[PDB]
Write a structure and sequence with these properties.
The structure holds 2 protein chains of 2 kinds. By secondary structure, chain A is an all-beta fold. Chain A contains no helices and 4 strands. Chain A has a two-stranded antiparallel sheet. In chain A, strands 3-4 form a two-stranded antiparallel sheet. In chain A, β3 and β4 form a beta hairpin. Chain A is elongated and about 40 Å long. Chain A starts with 10 loop residues before the first strand and ends in a 12-residue tail after the last strand. By secondary structure, chain B is mainly beta. Chain B folds into 2 domains: 127 residues, Thrombin, subunit H, CATH 2.40.10; 108 residues, Thrombin, subunit H (Beta Barrel), CATH 2.40.10.10. In chain B, the strands form 2 sheets. In chain B, strands 8-9-10-13-12-11 form a 6-stranded antiparallel β-barrel. Chain B starts with a strand and ends with a helix. The relative contact order of chain B is 0.23. The chains are: A mainly beta, B mainly beta. Chains A and B meet through loops of A and β12 of B. The structure holds the ligand *C[C@@](*)(O)[C@H](CCCNC(N)=[NH2+])NC(=O)[C@@H]1CCCN1C(=O)[C@H](N)Cc1ccccc1 and calcium ion. The site of the ligand *C[C@@](*)(O)[C@H](CCCNC(N)=[NH2+])NC(=O)[C@@H]1CCCN1C(=O)[C@H](N)Cc1ccccc1 has 19 residues of chain B, from β12. Chain A: It comes from Homo sapiens.
Chain lengths: 51, 235
């Protein structure tokens, strides 16, 4: 998780064998690329959606 | 907010205003549909308070506002253990009926202790509110916001005779002119992490507003995120 947060968009934890597990805050889901966070509810926290 | 600018509607959809024996006396942030996080010094006493989410212009109607009554107030248990220190200046407000989340009414994200502190140390946060726009001057009609840089602890300490605890941080500009101010207390200090905003502070106290050599003082939310999560659970 040392550099660029393991390339996790939100949260990174050190697992084993040099590798990472990313995770996201409530209302988001770990995207299939296993790094990014995607909305899992209609109005997830912390997001501007008015445009 | 001194030296800030007008928010757009929905730009800070976690921001709420508090109304009571004084109108627009403090701000807060939406934790979830039932809970607001604010400053404990805004809600000493069991006097009645209302919360307005989806607020933009406090003298006009936007048809985005949601007004709720506060039925329970939980100041941090160590607030006012020591008088007039403003240590642990943070409180939770439970609403009588859930907010309805929408583009104008949206929670702020709250990371764990480690990541809230990492986000704070990114060093640039947004503060917002309807407080004074000049020191000893009038309050804002339209929500104001301002980006403030984090200030290092030693500089923070030298800037004031009052004590800065490890539950506080400083933010503002070495040259002054831009600051939170009276009426902004309880509102958010937030850090934007790739388009998602996280709560990193609560607007707490200062000496005058926007004076050169002085900084705004903020409650350090990383120290309180376990407590926030414990008390605001939905079931
Ligand atoms: C309750 C909040 O609206 C308010 C926020 C002020 C933020 N100021 C800056 N410059 N960012 N906080 C307060 O009013 C708190 C709690 C009550 C006292 N207080 C202060 O900020 C006083 N100004 C602290 C003080 C300084 C010098 C002498 C006496 C008191
Ligand atoms: Ca309005």
């Amino acid at each position: 998780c040392n550099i660029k947060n393991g390339r996790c968009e939100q949260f990174c934890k050190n697992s084993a064998d040099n590798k990472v597990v990313c995770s996201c805050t409530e209302g988001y889901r770990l995207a299939e690329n296993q790094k990014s966070c995607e909305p899992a509810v209609p109005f997830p926290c912390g997001r501007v959606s008015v445009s | 907010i001194v030296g800030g600018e007008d928010a757009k509607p929905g730009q800070f959809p976690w921001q709420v205003v508090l109304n009571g024996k004084v109108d627009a006396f403090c701000g807060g942030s939406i934790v979830n549909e039932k809970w607001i996080v604010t400053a404990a010094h805004c809600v000493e006493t069991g006097v009645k308070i209302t919360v307005v989410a989806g607020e933009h212009n406090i003298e006009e109607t936007e048809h985005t506002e949601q007004k709720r009554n506060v039925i329970r107030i939980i100041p941090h248990h160590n607030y006012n253990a020591a008088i007039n220190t403003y240590n642990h200046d943070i409180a939770l407000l439970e609403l009588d009926e859930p907010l309805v989340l929408n583009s104008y009414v949206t929670p702020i994200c709250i990371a764990d202790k480690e990541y809230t502190n990492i986000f704070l140390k990114f060093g640039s946060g947004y503060v917002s509110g309807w407080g004074r726009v000049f020191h000893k001057g009038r309050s804002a009609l339209v929500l104001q916001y301002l980006r403030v840089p984090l200030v290092d602890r030693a500089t923070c300490l030298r800037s004031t005779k009052f004590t800065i605890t490890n539950n506080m941080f400083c933010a503002g500009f070495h040259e002054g002119g831009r600051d939170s101010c009276q009426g902004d207390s309880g509102g958010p200090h937030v850090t934007e992490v790739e388009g998602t905003s996280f709560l990193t502070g609560v607007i707490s106290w200062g000496e005058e507003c926007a004076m050169k050599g002085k900084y705004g003082i903020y409650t350090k939310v990383s120290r309180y995120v376990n407590w926030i999560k414990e008390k605001t659970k939905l079931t």
